[PDB]
Amino acid sequence: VQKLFVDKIREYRTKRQTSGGPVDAGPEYQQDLDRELFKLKQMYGKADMNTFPNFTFEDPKFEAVEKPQS
Amino acid sequence: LDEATLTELKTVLKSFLSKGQILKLEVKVDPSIMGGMIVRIGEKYVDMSAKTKIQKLSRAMR
Structure with a gap:
């Protein structure tokens, strides 16, 4: 069916x-591609485009041991 | 159809069998086949029709 191959x-x-x-989207493709775009972000997280990691960590404070000895 | 395209198919369908015989036939009109004809010499079924739209699933089949 090469006449169907051209068609x-x-x-x-x-x-x-x-x-x-x-x-021919109308209200169909506009709602569906916006419903799906939320679901790739809803249970995934709130993330911007280019923001780097901004945080700070504190380590364990080194206490001393008191010891009268000998 | 007309006479010039039917008397061939009442003669080119005799070229298959070749056993000293006088052929007979039935005709039934169906429009759901969009653009072809199916024929059944016994249990043969050479199908050339608009089934070939469903055979374009391979375009959607990766």
């Missing part, structure tokens, strides 16, 4: 004329 490539080239993502 699924030629209506693939029409999909390669794109402006803003989906062609």
Whole structure:
């Protein structure tokens, strides 16, 4: 069916004329890609784009031992 | 169809069997097959139709 071989490539080239993502999204693709974009961040964490690690650690304080001896 | 494309298929379907015989046939019209014809010489079923849209699952099958 090479007449069908040409007819699924030629209506693939029409999909390669794109402006803003989906062609017939409407309220469908706008809600779904925003529902999924939250879920990759919801149970994952709150993370910005480029912020480095900012913290500070304190070690164990070295106490002394009192000892009258001999 | 017309006479020039049917009397071939009432003669090129005789070229298969070749055993001194006088062939018979049935016709039934179906539009869900979009663009072809299926034929069944006995239990043979050479299928050429618009099933070939489902065979383009391999494009979506990695």
